[PDB]
Write a protein that binds this ligand. Structure first.
Ligand SMILES: Nc1nc2c(ncn2[C@@H]2O[C@H](COP(=O)(O)OP(=O)(O)OP(=O)(O)O)[C@@H](O)[C@H]2O)c(=O)[nH]1
Ligand SMILES: Nc1nc2c(ncn2[C@@H]2O[C@H](COP(=O)(O)OP(=O)(O)O)[C@@H](O)[C@H]2O)c(=O)[nH]1
Ligand SMILES: Nc1nc2c(ncn2[C@@H]2O[C@H](COP(=O)(O)OP(=O)(O)O)[C@@H](O)[C@H]2O)c(=O)[nH]1
Ligand SMILES: [Mg+2]
Lengths: 426, 118, 426, 426
């Protein structure tokens, strides 16, 4: 029976997991204790009749997880599941990959091993982290590396923060970002790269909230993950599992980087005054100004599009919207995909948290396009890392940590080769 | 050389100075509400079964500490605790009505199949 | 867990730390007796960072006070927060240095190096996992400028990996108090470059400047001057002691502040400084925080950054905000005054958020920045040290203690090489 | 059942045992009349270890006081617990030894042995099952160092299997008050090595050192020094008199601390020494007691264990704790100071716990150990004894008592042989 295990790493992983888990609890009706006054894909029953989240929060700093430990859901969560470290990497991939990992690699591996023992038929491993933090980078790299040989066939979804092209919370982020990409290339099945700046622009423009926060962002991340998992959780006319939409997204072993989009995202006051229907929501999913990654697909060509409707929706309207979007010259397709859509429908509308921002809306849409327009962000990162490595700044930190400096040039060349492959597809 | 005949009375002068400046602890026993360390007794030792009274406010301290933030504070304090602050569902969860709240939780022969997979 | 030991040297250091320990004790709700009288739970959640537990609900300073004269010790004991310190941590020697670097470093130093080393060691083995020590001292003294270097040199051999901040007070050329001041300064920076992870350049003349204009105080005492620097360092570790939306610590900025090991000198900046006539006519906003933050008059050092290039910038925010303004104001600054930032490091700014506001205040920020303007100080020291050394004046004081002559030559050579590799990075 | 008789020789021994009976009577709740005024049942269960029953519910100490001079006992009878003693147990001569070892061992000795041997015989036959005798004296006396050697020589013949302990006082070179003090000690240690199961090498000089630094008492009298030892013999016998989680007795310690019969000289210690200023700033914890103990300033003899190898160590604790922090600090100190422990004996240390704390205190710890540093004591005496004996100075006082000059040579050979094999075991 379908099961998805959370392997969230870092401060981003902890906050995003707490978000996603309040949405899972409100969706399944579970009280903050863990008692019910569908669920089994995420929860698990106990002798006491409680429901156990199948999440592994791992961090190198205590306080980020102790906030959860003294949070509301303390009795809901497992003291053993929450894995903490005493000293962090402090935005150092080398620290995160070579010096501090091996202390708790075994503990994290044992925790996910017992969770997989509890699960009967494992569908997927949803793994959340960031490309900026030394923890969320190096630890994610090593756990992908060991998890690949621990489970060869089990699918590993990779949700991760990518550094924003303009704003940044770190200076030493590009070194970790270039050194991490090897694991998301050779140890990942799907990757869901996200930069904060895009969601910042979206929530300012559409949601009318002039002063949002990380929990406002995490609300939409939980929403998109929930819409991904809704077909597994509840019934649909065309249920879509993980295997189906990875097969109809990944043409080659080297191309597993789709871009996502959620529609409709409007506040309640503006939601008062418009019809929300299939055509409008699928047109909003295609606007370059609504894309959650800072790139224009109009500068590239779509070669795959996974599609997840939700709520009150009819396949007649789905096919009409597909015809309408196909009849558009601004939207391009590569020559080797006359048919490049993967349509799924689910019955239950997306639920709403109190204190959130999106209004309750009867029909929603999640779009996952694999295109070639993402490579320009990697090109920007390549220029930034090149002018980093030209003067060999911050190299002494990693060298004292103990890695070999040729790996930097190797990672740069590897990402250049990935961009070249994307050019060959394009 | 260390002229201890002078040095010791320099130390005596100092000891008298912080003796004048010495202030006693004001007998305000505070304890961390985080955790305390304890030692298990011997159940049979004919001194260990001695009846002795407990404290009445410490129990209130734990019963207040081991509880969520909402009943602790009238208003929020940190942005990490805005999250899940109000668990009140704005409409009643009529989760028994299959008409509008269709659920795919395991039903009918699929429960037996979950048993049969083992 | 993450504990800080405050090593204390010099009359300037003793008075700075005494006021520094007062604000944190006030910040953590600590009475002169030593108990806890505050209200919030988070006031004691990371209290043990600076304090050690004693019986009866007592918290003791983890400070080691060092001075070569008994006269400072009675004064710090006679303060309102005077008895709160542990008497066994107090260490002193019978004879001073008379503002002589040579006497403190070599002659009278060797008799008191042992005793302080045991005291810091007992505090070192007390805490389970220490992040690193902490020292505040003055570069114009005989103990803090002299003796104080010898502590740093020894503890780096004993504890290499630990973080080492020093809040050294650099003497001013416009306002100086010692004739042999350049000799102590020249022989201390060479010890400072070799063994120090980060340095904070604080000057009393600039501290005199702000209270003249920013605060408009009629009679600024040295206690007021100690109030700012204590407020500065309270903003450095507030993210360490309290959780925030985006967390940080000393290792977070130090990795992100040092492109090359030869540089570790930074510029401290404090936000919420307004005079009595400025309180009535103002709107407390994050943009109002940033405009005073970058203004060259708010700084507490004797260098104008507009004459140089800003290498890296840190802005740690204290209180509750929304980062959109924080990100937009950082982005706004990084684009307008583009000439003052280096080109080989895009996104020079590092930001952090600590949710807990400072006591008695709501909005605050601390600025740490490495700019090319710090070489304005060392060369200004050089034009006096060479003007002291060519005629061998005031040399018999230093020659009589037992050293030869090339130590001055290697000291000026190292600082000349330091500024020389520093001009090349401009 | 398990009885110990206390032998009391010399003015040093008479005053030490007088305060020794004072503190343990407080521990057993005995008034100066002799009755029981205590509260706990456990205060009177094993009181017959040291006391003999008398009609009317009175208890008499099982002690024999011997001194060649009648003057000292008049002060003893004039003390607070003076009338407590049985008058018949007082045996005394008319003329003192004049600090002459030979007068007392030989000349004035033969008359007073008959009376004291009778009294100890009556007390030995009074008890059904005697563990053994204990003697308190000084090695610089005429009676304790003199007579006292002949008593143990005789009673070993009478009672070979019974254990005897001697808390003898070893003279110090830094402060001495007798010319022939080496001469008496030279002829006393030879009697100790032949007939003694365990010796507690106490020294006056460290006792004044401790009250000057650790207690900081301005005017330390002989009572405070006698109080310090009084805690030491109380801590030896607390596990015998009172039950604990892990019980022990003197034979538990005698067997486990003598690797070879020639080595029975040991180093006592007793932990909770805090000055009045130190009472405010502490946390009563098991680690605090251990760190205080293994530092050499706590030690009450005249030689540093850092210059030798700890052969055997034992730590007897008073109070109700748990043994893990007892065992982990036990394991921690064994691993850390590895060089100071011998290699041919793994697990060099022995532990015991007695539940009942000392009166008026919560925690007390007693250490009794064998270290190579005790050979520093014997060789220092030989540095003096040969200097006097080379010129035959102060010899006619001894030679007038009728013994040969060979006795100095055979004695001098004995500890020279002792320190030789003691050096061999290092
Ligand atoms: N979207 C989102 N991103 C976050 C969140 N928390 C941290 N991040 C990102 O993570 C990056 C830094 O890494 P952190 O997550 O803070 O910490 P880490 O992953 O444990 O790595 P280290 O800092 O080295 O310990 C920042 O640049 C943020 O962009 C979050 O709650 N939501
Ligand atoms: N900012 C500041 N500077 C101080 C204070 N007290 C002393 N100083 C400076 O310290 C210098 C003297 O230091 P000194 O006592 O010789 O240092 P020491 O030799 O290490 O003890 C003077 O030049 C003062 O400018 C203070 O409270 N605040
Ligand atoms: N620790 C301690 N030593 C003492 C005390 N009284 C005397 N002494 C020591 O005993 C020595 C003199 O002993 P003495 O009277 O000749 O012993 P006797 O010949 O056996 O009677 C002196 O050197 C003192 O140091 C005391 O109360 N405590
Ligand atoms: Mg982190």
């Amino acid at each position: 029976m379908r099961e998805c295990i959370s392997i969230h790493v870092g401060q981003a992983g902890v906050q995003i997991g707490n978000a996603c888990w309040e949405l899972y609890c409100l969706e399944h009706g579970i009280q903050p204790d863990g008692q019910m006054p569908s669920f089994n894909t995420f929860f698990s029953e106990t002798g006491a009749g409680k429901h156990v989240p199948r999440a592994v929060f791992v961090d190198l700093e205590p306080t980020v997880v102790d906030e959860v430990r003294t949070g509301t859901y303390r009795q809901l969560f497992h003291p053993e599941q929450l894995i903490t470290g005493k000293e962090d990497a402090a935005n150092n991939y080398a620290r995160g990959h070579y010096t501090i990992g091996k202390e708790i690699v075994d503990l994290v591996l044992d925790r996910i091993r017992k969770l997989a023992d509890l699960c009967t038929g494992l569908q997927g491993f949803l793994i959340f982290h960031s490309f900026g933090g030394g923890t969320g980078s190096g630890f994610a790299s090593l756990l992908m590396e060991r998890l690949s040989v621990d489970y060869g066939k089990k699918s590993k979804l990779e949700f991760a923060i990518y550094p924003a092209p303009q704003v940044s919370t770190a200076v030493v982020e590009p070194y970790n970002s270039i050194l991490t990409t090897h694991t998301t290339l050779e140890h990942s099945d799907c990757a869901f790269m996200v930069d904060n700046e895009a969601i910042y622009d979206i929530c300012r423009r559409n949601l009318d909230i002039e002063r949002p926060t990380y929990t406002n962002l995490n609300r939409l991340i939980g929403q998109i993950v929930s819409s991904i998992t809704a077909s597994l959780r509840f019934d649909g006319a065309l249920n879509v599992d993980l295997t189906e939409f990875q097969t109809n997204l990944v043409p080659y072993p080297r191309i597993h980087f789709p871009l996502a989009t959620y529609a409709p995202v409007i506040s309640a006051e503006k939601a008062y005054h418009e019809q929300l229907s299939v055509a409008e929501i699928t047109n909003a999913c295609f606007e370059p100004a609504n894309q959650m990654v800072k790139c224009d697909p109009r500068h590239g060509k779509y070669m795959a599009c996974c599609m997840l409707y939700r709520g009150d929706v009819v396949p007649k309207d789905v096919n009409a919207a597909i015809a309408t979007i196909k009849t558009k010259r601004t939207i391009q397709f590569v020559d080797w995909c006359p048919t490049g859509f993967k349509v799924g429908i689910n019955y239950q509308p997306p639920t709403v948290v109190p204190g959130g921002d999106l209004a309750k809306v009867q029909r929603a849409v999640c779009m996952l396009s694999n295109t070639t327009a993402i490579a320009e962000a990697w090109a920007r990162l390549d220029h930034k890392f090149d002018l980093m490595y030209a003067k060999r700044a911050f190299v002494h930190w990693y060298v004292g940590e103990g890695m070999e400096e040729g790996e930097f040039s190797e990672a740069r060349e590897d990402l250049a080769a990935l961009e070249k492959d994307y050019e060959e597809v394009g | 050389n260390q002229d201890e005949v002078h040095q010791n009375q320099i130390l005596r002068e100092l000891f008298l100075k912080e003796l004048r400046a010495q202030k006693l602890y004001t007998q305000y026993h505070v304890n961390p509400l985080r955790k305390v360390h304890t030692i298990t007794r011997k159940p049979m030792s004919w001194h260990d079964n001695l009846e002795e009274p407990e404290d009445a406010k410490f129990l209130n301290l734990i019963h207040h500490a081991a509880q969520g933030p909402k009943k602790k504070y009238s208003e929020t304090q940190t942005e990490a605790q805005e999250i899940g602050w109000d668990p009140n569902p704005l409409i009643n969860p009529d989760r028994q009505d299959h008409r509008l709240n269709h659920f795919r939780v395991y039903h009918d022969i699929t429960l037996y199949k979950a048993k049969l997979w083992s | 867990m993450r504990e800080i030991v405050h090593l204390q040297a010099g009359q300037c250091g003793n008075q700075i730390g005494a006021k520094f320990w007062e604000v944190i004790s006030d910040e953590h709700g600590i009475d002169p007796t030593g108990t806890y009288h505050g209200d919030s739970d988070l006031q004691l959640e990371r209290i043990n960072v600076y304090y050690n537990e004693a019986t009866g609900g007592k918290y003791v300073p983890r400070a080691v006070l060092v001075d070569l004269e008994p006269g400072t010790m009675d004064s710090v004991r006679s303060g309102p927060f005077g008895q709160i310190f542990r008497p066994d941590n107090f260490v002193f020697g019978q004879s001073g240095a008379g503002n002589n670097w040579a006497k403190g470093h070599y002659t009278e130093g060797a008799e008191l190096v042992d005793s302080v080393l045991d005291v810091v060691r007992k505090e070192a083995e007390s805490c389970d996992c220490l992040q690193g020590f902490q020292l505040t001292h003055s570069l114009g003294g005989g103990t803090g400028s002299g003796m104080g270097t010898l502590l740093i040199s020894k503890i780096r051999e004993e504890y290499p990996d630990r973080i080492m901040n020093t809040f050294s007070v650099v003497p001013s050329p416009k306002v100086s108090d010692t004739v042999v001041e350049p000799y102590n300064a020249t022989l201390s920076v060479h010890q400072l470059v070799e063994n120090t992870d980060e340095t904070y350049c604080i000057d009393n003349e600039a501290l005199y400047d702000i209270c003249f204009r920013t605060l408009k105080l009629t009679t600024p005492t040295y206690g007021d001057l100690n109030h700012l620097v204590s407020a500065t360092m309270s903003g450095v570790t507030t993210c360490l002691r309290f959780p925030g939306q985006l967390n940080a610590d000393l290792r977070k900025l130090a990795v992100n502040m040092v492109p090359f090991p030869r540089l570790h000198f930074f510029m401290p900046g404090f936000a919420p400084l307004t005079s009595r006539g400025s309180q009535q006519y103002r709107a407390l906003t994050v943009p109002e925080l940033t405009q005073q933050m970058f203004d060259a008059k708010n700084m507490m050092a004797a260098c104008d950054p507009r004459h140089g290039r800003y290498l890296t910038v840190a802005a740690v925010f204290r209180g509750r905000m929304s980062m959109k303004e924080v990100d937009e104001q950082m982005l706004n600054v990084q684009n307008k005054n583009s000439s003052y930032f280096v080109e080989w490091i895009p996104n020079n700014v590092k930001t952090a958020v600590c949710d807990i506001p400072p006591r008695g205040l709501k909005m605050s920020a601390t600025f740490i920045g490495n700019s090319t303007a710090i070489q304005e100080l060392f060369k200004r020291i050089s034009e006096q040290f060479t003007a002291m050394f060519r005629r061998k004046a005031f040399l018999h004081w230093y020659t009589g203690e037992g050293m030869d002559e090339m130590e001055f030559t290697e000291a000026e050579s190292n600082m000349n090489d330091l500024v020389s590799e520093y001009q090349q990075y401009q």
